[PDB]
Ligand binder design. Structure first.
Ligand SMILES: O=C(O)c1ccc(-c2nn(S(=O)(=O)c3ccccc3C(F)(F)F)c3ccc(Cl)cc23)c(OCc2ccccc2)c1
Lengths: 264, 261
């Protein structure tokens, strides 16, 4: 199908583009989280949150007065930013911009949720999550302690991330894996599935070789990573069901109509 | 890590046990569905009266209920066949007893829909050990919530069947599903994942030898476990609607235990 040297070329192409499109790489985030590097400002309670916004000025925690909502909303602000970074990255995947324009939009629409969850694990450990390009760190305990349903909104993301991180993928692995997710030929409404699965076949070959060369001791890591695509689809659907319960319950949630449109 | 000849021995073992455990194979089912055989033609059920004639030929309540009850009777039989097969998977019966139960609890339904695809084409499904064939249209036309019970299984089967797996492939794939270390409540994840590693190596080699032109079939088959998980969840939500609506309607004790939690 594809020759080994071409698969290495595709892997390197995707890695180079992944570094340019995403500001905070997994390699950099792990340096911050482990204490192996300007320590980030830590948000662990209500007062430290108040000081963090006053001193660091986090752009997702600014002008809807209740903290739990403010944080919940802040997460959606960052997610919308991440969609644009993922969209730019996808343009670098060989073949993608040659696809039918509606199919490109469909692949991004249904794939960004899975990729956001995947890449959020890079920024997490069992104790919290990096924010604002790594300058802040919000503790798991503070997040889980948010009232009513907002506390239980955050914890599932940590539970997935802890399991996903046990695979010990690095950025060069993740760049191919993210590409594989985007090129899923089973998204609803696709007009021309054939070139999408043709590209995914190439990407899967490149991921397989990448994993054997970069983790030669990690038996069947390729298979195990593919099994995580089950966890991703399952958690996205759960996430959707969680929002719908918020939307139908919480009357303090309204933003400026123009803001509501941006985050539709 | 395992040797090539050891992986071929494991595939042959599993295929052998699969033939012993499941009376209606994919190979037999396809001979029935494709026809050109006067000794294996099924009686076709497409409406009430042909169902009426079916009782006499294949051998007191509402039709949609009788059909539903029939599936649960067959589901219990399938759980029995699947449990027999699992005991033959090297290492399974050596596991902690609670884990054996847990793997079966969460695995039997994913396997049932996998092997049900073998009995399906786009127009209907074989029943009663291949003697009957019930049309998709007739099933979809059942009243209440029962009409929508089967259609998602058909939608999966049509896609899954496009992979063109045979029984020797499916024997390893089914084993991989059972030995899933991510089932909730498992006590000893590590020995389960050691077994699945061997099974995954064996499935990979099997697919390369038996489908050499079918690029990345291994990867594409594993992505199908996502479709399986979704169908189980849909089915469970349908049962709960039934439990709260049909209060004269009982489930088999074996089935009730599987669906608890
Ligand atoms: O930098 C990043 O790469 C980054 C990306 C995403 C998120 C985040 N998004 N969301 S989300 O809005 O629910 C959402 C929306 C659409 C689709 C998926 C999701 C989601 F999968 F993740 F669940 C979150 C919910 C909980 C948590 Cl802990 C994180 C997120 C992110 O959070 C950083 C953050 C944390 C606290 C306060 C402010 C910012 C960072």
């Amino acid at each position: 199908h594809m020759e080994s040297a071409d698969l290495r070329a595709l892997a390197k192409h995707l890695y180079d583009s992944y570094i340019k499109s995403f500001p905070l790489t997994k390699a950099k985030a792990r340096a911050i989280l482990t204490g192996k590097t300007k320590s980030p400002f830590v948000i662990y309670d209500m007062n430290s949150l108040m000081m963090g916004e006053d001193k660091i000025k986090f752009k997702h925690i600014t002008p809807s007065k209740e903290v739990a909502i403010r944080i919940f909303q802040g997460c959606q602000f960052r997610s919308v930013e991440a969609v644009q970074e993922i969209t730019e990255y996808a343009k670098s995947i060989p073949g993608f911009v040659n696809l039918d324009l509606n199919d490109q939009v469909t692949l991004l629409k249904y794939g960004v949720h899975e990729i956001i969850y995947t890449m959020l694990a890079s920024l997490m450990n069992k104790d919290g999550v990096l924010i604002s390009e790594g300058q802040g760190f919000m503790t798991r305990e503070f997040l889980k302690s948010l009232r009513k349903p907002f506390g239980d909104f955050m914890e599932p993301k940590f539970e997935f991330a802890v399991k996903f991180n046990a695979l010990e993928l690095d950025d060069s692995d993740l760049a191919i894996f993210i590409a594989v997710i985007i090129l899923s030929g089973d998204r609803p409404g696709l007009l021309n599935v054939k070139p999408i699965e043709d590209i995914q076949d190439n990407l899967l070959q490149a991921l397989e070789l990448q994993l054997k060369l970069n983790h030669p001791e990690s038996s069947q890591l390729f298979a195990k990573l593919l099994q995580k695509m089950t966890d991703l689809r399952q958690i996205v659907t759960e996430h959707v069901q969680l929002l719908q319960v918020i939307k139908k319950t919480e009357t303090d949630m309204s933003l400026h109509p123009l803001l509501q449109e941006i985050y539709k």
